[PDB]
Structures are given as C-alpha cells and as structure tokens.
Structure 1
Amino acid sequence: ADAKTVQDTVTQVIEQNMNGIDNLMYMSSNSDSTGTVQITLTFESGTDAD
C-alpha cells in the first residue's frame, strides 16, 4: 500500500481514537510507502510504563 493510501486510512483512524490518555507529552506518527506506520506516544518522565 502506497504512502497516501496508509497515512489517510490507518494513521488518521488511530490518531483520532488516541484521546483520553494520562500524562502524555506528544504524539509523533511516521508513515511511509512501504506500508508500515509508527505512532509514538511519549509520556512524562517517571510515569508507570506498564
């Protein structure tokens, strides 16, 4: 699946549902032409990783 085909489908559907989360600092999503996507949620330093 091409870049625009995945970033429009998967990323946007995940990012929009990524609401109602504790101690979150920022959300950085990288999505490329190979098909794979990677949303990273970096939380405040010291929070319960589990």
Structure 2
Amino acid sequence: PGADAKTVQDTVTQVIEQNMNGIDNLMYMSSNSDSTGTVQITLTFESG
C-alpha cells in the first residue's frame, strides 16, 4: 500500500518471480504490478 508499480515490481514482483524457478510442469508465468500497490503473479502449468 502506497507504492507505485515500479517500486512494487522492484521490491515484490521480481523478488518473488526470480524464486519461481525449479517448479515442475510450468508452461508460462504472467504478472502485473499496479500503482494501487497490488501484485498478481499467475503460474499456468502443463495439462494433466
């Protein structure tokens, strides 16, 4: 809360995203950082 997208991305999104390595059946990972302070990181996995 209170942080802009850039601040949020540098201190949260990247910090989380860089750790989302070595996960099984990860097809693609999309995320967005908002000027409302919100982070959403969705990891979509292989079928089955």
Q: Same fold (TM over 0.5)?
A: yes
- How far did 1:45 drift? 1.4
Following the alignment from structure 2 to structure 1, what is the Cα–Cα distance between the partners of residues 15 and 21? 12
- How far did 1:30 drift? 1.0
Aligned length: 46
Residue identity over aligned pairs, in percent, reads: 100
Moved beyond 4 Å, runs of 4+: none
Supply the RMSD in Å over aligned alpha carbons. Answer: 0.7
Where 1:30 maps in the other structure, the secondary structure is strand
Give TM-score scaled by structure 1 length: 0.85
Following the alignment from structure 1 to structure 2, what is the Cα–Cα distance between the partners of residues 14 and 42? 16
